[model samples]
Target: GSRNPNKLDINTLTGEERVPVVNKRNGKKMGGAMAPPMKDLPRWLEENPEFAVAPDWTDIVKQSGFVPESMFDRLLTGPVVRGEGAS
Candidate 1:
């Protein structure tokens, strides 16, 4: 499917400065194209605090392949920008 030219423009902004890119063709905001959902890890941690440790984390990271060891710190600190073109 063809993409909107305006969506291409927003893709150039700093991650924090960008907003959800709209699909002009369908009027739907693009998904998985931005960062991993910031709330997901935290919410999971809240529910299962034990999973925060090493081997446990290894399992989580292995399955999801989205959250990496390096990203944990940043993700814990605050909201992180989604990776560009990630979706």
Candidate 2:
């Protein structure tokens, strides 16, 4: 003789051996990318002292998706003027 609506046994496993769980309360997934656990500025700077003066942006700028292909195309096929009246 039991009378409890919110006393359902969903998982029948121990606490330490249970699988990862995700609550479905408001129909939204949780756990996304966040800030790094620890900062690596001091250590990184110490390792590369030259970077403290003039930083090299070769590696970082390469990953940034900011190509200027459109500008190059326009400059390549803009106009051609050789003489005074050569339209």
Q: Tens-digit lDDT track for model 2 on 11-58?
A: 221221111111223211111121011123223323433321101111
CA lDDT of each prediction against the hidden true structure: 0.32, 0.20
Residue pairs with backbone overlap in model 1: 32-87, 35-82
Who wins the TM-score comparison?
1
TM-score of each: 0.19, 0.17
lDDT of 2 at 58: 16
Q: Which regions of candidate 1 are displaced past 4 Å?
A: 1-39, 46-60, 71-87
On lDDT, the candidate that comes out on top is: 1
Provide the clash count, candidate 2: 0
- lDDT, residue 12, model 2: 22
